[PDB]
């Protein structure tokens, strides 16, 4: 809400801050009053960049930094992979070592081509999906429920 305004229509923010940033594959600031401007023509196209969007690629976000939006959103998907708990590995190095590649993948996905990452992620899928992904995914609700109370 502290931003001066939209790159195109910088008038609604001054009047009220109720408008919230909308995340997109462009990692690219947009505003609700300006979202309607995109639906009328293009229907999922960035005004200046013109990046195509499948169905509006819109989700509410409140992080003024566009890079954080992509970094945070990408990290959300990556967390679905490599979610195995630390204690699963007795080796001291292996605890945080795999997290390093996870961070590398996130940064690799942000800017560089994800084709290598997608191909790599497929290799992990064939192995992790069987036991670890299913086990940790189910246990996420159990730990979260206990943690909340």
Partner 1 sequence: MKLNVDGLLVYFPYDYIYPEQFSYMRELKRTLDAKGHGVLEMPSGTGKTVSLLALIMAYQRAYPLEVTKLIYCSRTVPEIEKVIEELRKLLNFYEKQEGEKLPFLGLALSSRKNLCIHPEVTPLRFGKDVDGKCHSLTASYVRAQYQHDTSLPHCRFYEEFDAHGREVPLPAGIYNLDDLKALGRRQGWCPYFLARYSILHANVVVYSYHYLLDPKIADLVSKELARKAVVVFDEAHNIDNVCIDSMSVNLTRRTLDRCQGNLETLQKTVLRIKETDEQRLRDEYRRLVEGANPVLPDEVLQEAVPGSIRTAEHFLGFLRRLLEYVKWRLRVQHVVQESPPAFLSGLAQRVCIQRKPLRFCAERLRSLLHTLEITDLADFSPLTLLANFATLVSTYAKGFTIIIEPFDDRTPTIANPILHFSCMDASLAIKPVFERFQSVIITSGTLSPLDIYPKILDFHPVTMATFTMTLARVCLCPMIIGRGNDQVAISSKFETREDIAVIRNYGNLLLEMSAVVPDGIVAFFTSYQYMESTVASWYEQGILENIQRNKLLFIETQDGAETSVALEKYQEACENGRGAILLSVARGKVSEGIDFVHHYGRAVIMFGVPYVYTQSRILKARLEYLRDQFQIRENDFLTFDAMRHAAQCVGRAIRGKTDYGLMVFADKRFARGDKRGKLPRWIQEHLTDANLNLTVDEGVQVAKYFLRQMAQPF
Residues that bind partner 1 (CB under 8 A): 1-2, 62-65, 67-68, 71-72, 75-76, 79, 92-93, 95-96, 99-100, 102-104, 107, 147
Give the nearest distance from C-beta 72 to partner 1 in angstroms. Answer: 6
Please tell me what DSSP assigns to residue 18: -
Distance of CA 119 to the CA centre of its chain: 19
**Which structure tokens are listed for 38?**
């995109």
Task: Indicate the residue among 126 and 144 with the shorter CB distance to partner 1.
Answer: 144
What is the C-alpha to C-alpha distance for residues 102 and 120, in angstroms, rounded to an integer?
12
The answer to whether 26 contacts Zn ion (rule: CB under 5 A) is yes
Which of 46, 81, 124, 132 binds Zn ion (CB under 5 A)? It is 46
The answer to whether 28 contacts Zn ion (rule: CB under 5 A) is yes
Q: Which residue is nearest to Zn ion (CB)?
A: 34
What is the C-alpha to C-alpha distance for residues 12 and 6, in angstroms, rounded to an integer?
8
If residue 128 lies in a helix (H) or strand (E), which one and from where to where?
Answer: helix 115-128
């Amino acid at each position: 809400m502290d931003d001066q305004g939209c790159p195109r229509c910088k008038t609604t923010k001054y009047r009220n801050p109720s408008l919230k940033l909308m995340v997109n594959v462009c990692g690219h600031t947009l505003c609700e009053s300006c979202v309607d401007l995109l639906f009328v023509r293009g229907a999922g196209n960035c005004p200046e960049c013109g990046t195509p969007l499948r169905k509006s690629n819109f989700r509410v976000q409140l992080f003024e930094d566009p890079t954080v939006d992509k970094e945070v959103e990408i990290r959300k998907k990556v967390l679905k992979i490599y979610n195995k708990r630390e204690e699963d590995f007795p080796s001291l190095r292996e605890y945080n070592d795999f997290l390093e590649e996870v961070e590398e993948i996130v940064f690799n996905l942000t800017n560089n081509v994800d084709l290598d990452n997608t191909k790599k992620k497929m290799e992990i899928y064939q192995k992790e999906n069987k036991d670890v992904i299913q086990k940790n995914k189910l246990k996420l609700t159990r730990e979260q429920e206990e943690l909340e109370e």
